[PDB]
Each structure stands twice: as C-alpha cells, then as structure tokens.
C-alpha cells in the first residue's frame, strides 16, 4: 500500500564557500536510511503522467547547480529524502515514525539554511529558494511538535 511515485522524483531521489551562521554536517537519519534502502532494492510502483509542473520538475533539474556544485546538489537530495521520509509515515504506514527524533529534523534545517544562502548569490535560480524558505519553516514546526506527537500516539 504505497501511492506510485512520479518518474521525475524517483530518478531524482535514487542518487571553498562556507556560511558563517549555519553549516552542514552531511548526517542522515535512521528513518531516511531505511527508506533509501527500500527504494534501492524493491521496485516501488511509479506513475506515467507528469502533469504537476512544480517541485523538482524543471526547477531542480533545470538549474545549473547539478553540474556546477555537485556537493550542494547532495544537500538538496538529503533534504528531499528527509522531506519525503517524514511525509511517508504520517500519510501512510505510521509504524516507521518510531525511528524519527528531534535531532533528525534539526540538522536538516541547518543544511537547508546553508544551501539556501548559497543560492541567494545566484540571481536566476531564486525560484528554488522560494520553496525552500516555505519548507524551512515547515520543518521547524515538526521540530517543535514531533516529541509531543509520539507520546500522544
């Protein structure tokens, strides 16, 4: 029981400058690890249409960040995996929400702020930052609310 995934997102998800305020650590969550293995091994169902022209569709692949800064492109993937992991459990199969903890989302936001600040230098690709800032405050609400949800459930 899994909704099929778009071809775009599925291809995207399957694999010097430094900011003074927030810095990354390239640390992955346990929950994000388990999902990555599931997608790597098992053949999840996938859709055929690509009507939804949002998110990584012509924004994350269109930008030159993929070729220019591949390290920065590894941060974006981690945030998507961490964003896709938290959306996975709550919508369906909540049994995997046991492995998520506070520090899992803490580090994700810090990684978000660093890549977001670096994208601010580029004047073309501000469209990607537009969604990231909205997503940035989404993770913080989970950060300040995830310890209460597990005890309630």
């Amino acid at each position: 029981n899994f909704i099929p995934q778009p071809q775009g997102l599925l291809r995207f998800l399957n694999t010097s400058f430094v900011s003074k305020f927030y810095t990354p650590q390239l640390q992955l969550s346990e929950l994000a690890k388990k999902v990555l293995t599931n997608i790597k091994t098992d053949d999840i169902p996938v859709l055929e249409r690509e009507f939804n022209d949002n998110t990584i569709i012509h924004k994350a692949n269109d930008t030159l960040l993929k070729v220019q800064a591949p390290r920065m492109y590894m941060i974006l993937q981690s945030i998507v995996l961490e964003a896709y992991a938290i959306v996975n459990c709550f919508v369906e199969n909540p049994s995997s929400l046991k492995y998520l903890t506070e520090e899992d989302v803490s580090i994700t936001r810090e990684n978000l702020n660093y890549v977001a600040d670096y994208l601010g230098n580029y004047d073309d690709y501000n469209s990607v930052v537009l969604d990231l800032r909205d997503l940035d405050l989404c993770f913080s609400a989970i950060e300040l609310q995830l310890p209460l949800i597990k005890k309630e459930a």
Partner: protein, 348 residues
C-alpha cells in the same frame, strides 16, 4: 532591482542596531531580537524575489499587449480507432454521431468523440473512424492499446483498440517557439527581403515550415501543411497574403514540395531485460515515425537530433542506438521533404 539575500540584510540590520546607540543588545542565536531580525530579512527577501518575478511577468505581458502579436491556442488530440466485430456484418449498420470513446485505465480517463457520420457496410469485419479528444491538452497523447471502450455500441462489436498512439495533442504554445516567431516578425518589419517573405508565408496557422529560393528576378516559396500537402485554396490564400509582403516588380511562384522516403532500420540497446516487449517496440516505432513527420523543408537528415530525440524518452532505460546505412547526413534539396519512411526495430 538587485537581489538582496537574508545574510546581507541581517548583517546590515545588526550593524545599524549596534551603531544606533545600543551596546546592551546582543545578537546571539536563540534570542528574540535575532529571530525577529531574521524574519524581517526573509520578508524583504521574499519581496525582492516576488518583485523580480513580477518584473519578468510585466515584461512578457507588455510584449503581448504591444503590437498585435499573440500566441495561438492548443490543438486537440486526434487519431484513429479500430473496431473488431465477432463476424462480418450481414446488413449495413449506422453509427450515431457523437459516439463516445473512452478507456478504463485510471491513468487516462480522458474522453473522445466523433465529429461526422459513419456507416458500417455489410461483409466488413472491421471499421476505422477518426476521433477527437474533447479535453484540450497533452493528456490525449495516450500510448498504444489504451482506448478500449465504446458507448452506445451494439453486441456485434468484439474489441476496441487503437493501433497507434496519437502523439498529436499539445499544450499551450511554447515560450521558445513564440519567442522565435516574434523574432521572425521583428526582422520582417523591413519588407522586400527573404525574411519578410518568410514571415508572410509562415503567418498562416495551417502552413508549417516553408522555404524560400531566390533565383534572379524569380522568387519561389516551397510551402506545405502538417500533412505535407498543399490544397489549392490554401495555396491561393498564401499567395494573397504574400501579395502585400511581396517585393514589387519581381516574380513569385509556388509549387508545393516533393516528399522522399527512406528506411532507417534503427536498432536500440535496452538496459532492462525485463522491460523489453512488443509494446515498447511499437512505441519506439511510433515515436520515430512521428519525428519523421512535422519536419520542415530543406534540412539534412541529421542523426544526432534523431538519437537525442529517441533517448529523450528515457535516459536510463535506453542505453544506446546505432544505424546501418544512414550514418552520414542525407542532404535534402530545396524541394525535398523527408516525411515518409518505414521503420524496423532490431533490438540487440
């Protein structure tokens, strides 16, 4: 104006606060003043980004409003559908107009409908009628064997199936194609020149990919429609349109275009051995044949664009493609168009 990021605005606010006769205040993280500063900075960032996006939208909308040059609307998908009966009809049957053709897959719930009457004469085990997608979008470009349903159908019908994917529907006109047509129009403001004739020939919505050949005192325009034909009425309409745009005191004449047939015999290597199947072969054949059509006049049979077009379907699934005889580009004359051609797929 110039785009200002969060960190710069935050540094500028911190520096104004420090310089503003305030030594008590601190900007460590976790403070309320630091969070409010960051929020304000992010609001200003949002405002600048939205301002830049509104400037782009404004430029596009002013260019649309300026002059009388606007993009054209989308084309409805259409194609052929094949009817299979249990037995040849003993008497002539009539199909009611506006019969609805649909599918049962959840991925393609888009409807179809016929425009004209059709008649199923007796002793005929199959009939083919054309169909038009009611929804205006690319959803009509359904793969092979999708449209497997008929409304108000008699018991005689055994199976409904489309032999070939449509691949004709389109979305709204592409920003790049509009930009190019607008360039054509701008360069065509100076009349009496090759580009002026070109725009005057291309401005008709039916004609597609014209060419001009300028012999001494003797223009010729090689115009064809999406089907590669040139009806007399459309030819006269093109001539009348070009009359305004034609250089004075110099001959103009038109004579359509002569088609040419080549067999590509392409071969493709597929990474996934399980995914290989007859359906994928048919889809590759239809994609290649469609690529062969909707091609303009007087352009060589470039193979690099062919292979990039067929690899565009799936970069990972499709591994490599090779050819047997057409490895060298075939130079086409001014009155040649490469539209016909039989495709045989030879998977390795």
């Amino acid at each position: 104006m110039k785009t200002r990021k969060l960190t710069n605005i935050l540094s500028k606010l911190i520096d104004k606060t420090m310089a503003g006769t305030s030594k008590i205040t601190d900007f460590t993280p976790g403070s309320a003043s630091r969070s409010l500063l960051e929020a304000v900075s992010l609001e200003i960032e949002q405002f600048y980004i939205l301002t830049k996006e509104n400037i782009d939208w404004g430029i596009q909308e002013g260019i649309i409003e300026a002059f009388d040059f606007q993009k054209r609307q989308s084309k409805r998908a259409y194609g052929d559908v094949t009817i299979q009966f249990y037995q040849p009809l003993d008497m002539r049957m009539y199909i009611p107009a506006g019969t609805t053709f649909t599918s049962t897959r959840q991925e393609y719930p888009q409807q179809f409908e016929t425009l004209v009457d059709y008649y199923a004469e007796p002793d005929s085990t199959e009939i083919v009628v054309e169909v038009y997608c009611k929804e205006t979008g690319v959803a009509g470009n359904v793969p092979e064997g999708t449209i497997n349903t008929i409304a108000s159908g008699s018991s005689l019908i055994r199976s409904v199936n489309n032999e070939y994917s449509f691949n004709t529907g389109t979305k709204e006109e592409s920003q790049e194609d509009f930009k190019r047509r607008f360039h054509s129009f701008v360069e065509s403001r100076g009349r009496a020149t090759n580009k002026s004739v070109r725009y005057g020939a291309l401005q008709i919505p039916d004609v597609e990919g014209v060419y001009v050949y300028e012999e001494t005192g003797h223009i010729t325009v090689f115009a064809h429609d999406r089907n590669g034909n040139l009806s007399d009425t459309l030819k006269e309409d093109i001539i009348d349109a070009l009359q305004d745009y034609r250089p004075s005191g110099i001959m103009l004449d038109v004579t359509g275009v002569e088609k040419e047939e080549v067999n590509v015999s392409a071969t493709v290597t597929i990474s996934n051995k399980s995914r290989i199947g007859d359906t994928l072969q048919k889809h590759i054949e239809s994609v290649i044949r469609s690529y062969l059509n909707n091609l303009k006049t007087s352009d060589d049979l470039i193979i690099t664009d062919l292979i990039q077009a067929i690899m565009n379907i799936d970069d990972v699934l499709i591994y490599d493609v090779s050819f047997d005889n057409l490895d060298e580009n075939i130079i086409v004359p001014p009155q040649g168009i490469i539209r016909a051609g039989e495709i045989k797929v030879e998977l390795k």
